[PDB]
Amino acid sequence: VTNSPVVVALDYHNRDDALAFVDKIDPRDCRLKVGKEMFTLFGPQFVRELQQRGFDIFLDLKFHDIPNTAAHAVAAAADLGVWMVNVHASGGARMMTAAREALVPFGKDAPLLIAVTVLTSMEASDLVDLGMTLSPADYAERLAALTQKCGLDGVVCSAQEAVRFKQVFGQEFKLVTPGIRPQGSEAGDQRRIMTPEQALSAGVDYMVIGRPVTQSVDPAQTLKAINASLQ
Amino acid sequence: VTNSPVVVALDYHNRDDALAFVDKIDPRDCRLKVGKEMFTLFGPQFVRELQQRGFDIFLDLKFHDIPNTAAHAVAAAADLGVWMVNVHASGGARMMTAAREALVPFGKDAPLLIAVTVLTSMEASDLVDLGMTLSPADYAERLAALTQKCGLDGVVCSAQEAVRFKQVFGQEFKLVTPGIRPQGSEAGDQRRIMTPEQALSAGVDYMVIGRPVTQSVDPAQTLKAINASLQ
Ligand SMILES: O=C1CC(=O)N([C@@H]2O[C@H](COP(=O)(O)O)[C@@H](O)[C@H]2O)C(=O)N1
Ligand SMILES: O=C1CC(=O)N([C@@H]2O[C@H](COP(=O)(O)O)[C@@H](O)[C@H]2O)C(=O)N1
């Protein structure tokens, strides 16, 4: 296990470019996140390579499909033995329930099943195009509520919803929060940001950090520094 | 190439079972869809093996993430050289815009880019939980309008919307529709369904068929039957 609440988003377009970073850090420094980019590129074998080195892996594929597919996919992720696996809460109750139920057969080995609420890159203007009347926070709370009701272990959201969410769902409902920008860092397409420190104070369980770390020369050192701040 | 609008959904938990089927057919008979289940299990290499056989592959991972991730994932799909790649329209305009732009550097090689509107497994009730008051039809049409405004090649929807969409977005805008159930077959978690013949008559450009084919007592003849019906 590890003590840092940091999950580094491995978003490279090259395998060796990722492992060059990974070989310089240690499983106690952080957990790793394999998303759509690196998974579309290298598949489940890359995830096994990381599990080989001993890291906990968060397969971030945000499964957002029909119940049938969602279940089989989560079951496939469970076969991979990942630490945590994704799903989109906007996929609905039936889809989320089918996903949870697909993990029962794996018993204890099952990975944590988290639901994405509202992407941290979306503000009201973004949600407004879908005809979504509610603010990011409000809609996100509606999605998390459905997530909790379907028995999921937690949610992915912005740290800007951490205090509120922690209160409405409790300390047990895990909150995984991306949109982490230490001060000075470039926001990019990220919108509901917060600094590593602000996120921890908001009481999040896990913070997802990508570019601030991977975009630096010597990213291991940056990951180290961030961890230092969380003390 | 094939002149059939049929795209068979390869949803198997066993690589060889899937190949045993694929080998009983021919690229001239249909196209194949590799979804989250098989892709999570066997990754990009499976797609290549299907491609090495001459089939046009529809990569269906419904990328629904922050603009930066959607772009890199879509780019990764183009690197795979697939015929068609997926995306979730509810991901917003900025995300879909990033996806379209990430395909520009691939020129002519760029795969077809389509956005999923409302999943065929959903009805009003399913959307109500999300706080969505618009009907599956209207919400879908809204998602299809945004998809076109962002410059995508088409949308994934129900055949129940084909007629409407076709006359509101034009013949050019491509419609890919799952939820295809020939009379007698099981509906399952599918809700907004139509038979192959009805879907064709409805104007869909491509129709996705999974269980009706893969789980039939003789999938090859079932494909043959359907293809013949569509004539
Ligand atoms: O709401 C979310 C969820 C999410 O997974 N992510 C992911 O977090 C990662 C890192 O983003 P960044 O480089 O820190 O901006 C990427 O893999 C994103 O897709 C996000 O940015 N917002
Ligand atoms: O709206 C949609 C999109 C979609 O991709 N699909 C996919 O179409 C496939 C076949 O479903 P079925 O077996 O025909 O019910 C599965 O891979 C689904 O994920 C769907 O059923 N509805």
Curated annotation (Swiss-Prot), chains A, B:
EC number(s) given by UniProt: 4.1.1.23
SMART domains: OMPdecase
GO biological process, alphabetically ordered: 'de novo' pyrimidine nucleobase biosynthetic process; 'de novo' UMP biosynthetic process; nucleobase-containing small molecule interconversion
GO CC annotation: cytoplasm; cytosol
Keywords: Decarboxylase, Lyase, Pyrimidine biosynthesis
Record pathway: Pyrimidine metabolism; UMP biosynthesis via de novo pathway; UMP from orotate: step 2/2
Catalytic activity: orotidine 5'-phosphate + H(+) = UMP + CO2
Pfam families, per database record: OMPdecase
A GO molecular-function annotation: orotidine-5'-phosphate decarboxylase activity
Chain sites annotated for binding substrate: 11, 33, 60-69, 120, 181, 190, 210-211
Residues the record marks as active site: 62
Subunit architecture: Homodimer.
PANTHER family: OROTIDINE 5'-PHOSPHATE DECARBOXYLASE (PTHR32119:SF2)
Main function: Catalyzes the decarboxylation of orotidine 5'-monophosphate (OMP) to uridine 5'-monophosphate (UMP).
Family assignment from sequence similarity: Belongs to the OMP decarboxylase family. Type 1 subfamily.
Protein's name in the database: Orotidine 5'-phosphate decarboxylase
Gene: pyrF
